[PDB]
Amino acid sequence: IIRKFEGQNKKFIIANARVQNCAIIYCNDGFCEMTGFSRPDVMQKPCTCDFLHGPETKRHDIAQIAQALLGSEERKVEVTYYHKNGSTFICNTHIIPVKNQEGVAMMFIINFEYVTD
Amino acid sequence: IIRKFEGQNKKFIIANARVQNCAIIYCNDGFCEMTGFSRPDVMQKPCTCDFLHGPETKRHDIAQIAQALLGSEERKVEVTYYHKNGSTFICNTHIIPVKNQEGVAMMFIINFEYVTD
C-alpha cells in the first residue's frame, strides 16, 4: 500500500505505532502540498496530526480517529481540517494499521483524501 | 508490501531515498532478531546496512546492492553478511524502490531472506 499511495500521488504519512507518541517517520510531498505544512514541521509529530485541527474540527471526529489508532483498527473518518493558511478542508482520514503476524500494530499508514464541499 | 512483510514476520527495513545517506527510518523486530543488531544500533544508518559487512562479504555483491539503490532499481542480490556475533549467514537482499508517479524513488523497502548453506 505504500507503493500504491506514493505511486498515485496520494497524500499520506507513516507513523511508528510502537512509540508512545505515534511519531510520524515519513510524510510524502502530496501531504505537505495539500496541508501547506513543510516536512520539517510534520516529522516526528504525533500521527493524529493535531497541527491540522482548528475551531471547526469536531471533537467526535478527532475522538474516532484517535480511537482507531488506540485500538489498532482500520477506519475511515470524515473530518474538517485546516490548511496552514487557516482555510478549512474536508478530509476522509483512512487509518491503516500495519500488524506483525501476532496481530500487533508496528506502523500506521494514514491516507488523507480531500473531499470537495 | 510493508503489510505483507510485517504480516509474514519477514525481516526488513524502510529507508528514506530522498536524503543523501539513505537513512533507515524503520527496522522490524525480525531484522534485529536475525542480525543480532539492536534497533538503536540500526536506526538512521545507511540503507546499505554496512554494519552487516565483514571479511567474506564480496565487493562485487556490495557493489550490486549499492548500484540498485543508486539507480532506483528493484534487484535481488545474494550476499554473505555477518551476525553481530561474527558468524556468517547467506542472504538474499531484495531492494524495492517506492516511487512517486513521476518515477522518483521516495523510499526503499529492503527485505533480507536467510539462505541455508
UniProtKB/Swiss-Prot annotation, chains A, B:
PAS domain boundaries: 24-53
Subcellular location(s) of the protein: Cell membrane
Tissue distribution: Expressed in prolactin-secreting adenomas.
Domain PAC: from-to ranges: 75-117
Superkingdom of this protein's organism: Eukaryota
Family membership: Belongs to the potassium channel family. H (Eag) (TC 1.A.1.20) subfamily. Kv11.3/KCNH7 sub-subfamily.
Domain characteristics, as noted in the entry: The S4-S5 linker acts as a signal integrator where it both couples voltage-sensor domain (VSD) movement to pore opening and closure, as well as providing a binding site for other domains that regulate activation and/or deactivation of the channel.
Subunit comment: The potassium channel is probably composed of a homo- or heterotetrameric complex of pore-forming alpha subunits that can associate only within their subfamily.
Purpose: Pore-forming (alpha) subunit of voltage-gated inwardly rectifying potassium channel. Exhibits faster activation and deactivation kinetics and slow inactivation at membrane potentials positive to 240 mV, resulting in the weakest inward rectification.
Protein name per the record: Voltage-gated inwardly rectifying potassium channel KCNH7
Organism whose genome encodes this protein: Homo sapiens
Organism phylogeny: Eukaryota, Metazoa, Chordata, Craniata, Vertebrata
Gene: KCNH7
Portion of the full sequence shown: 18 to 134 of 1196
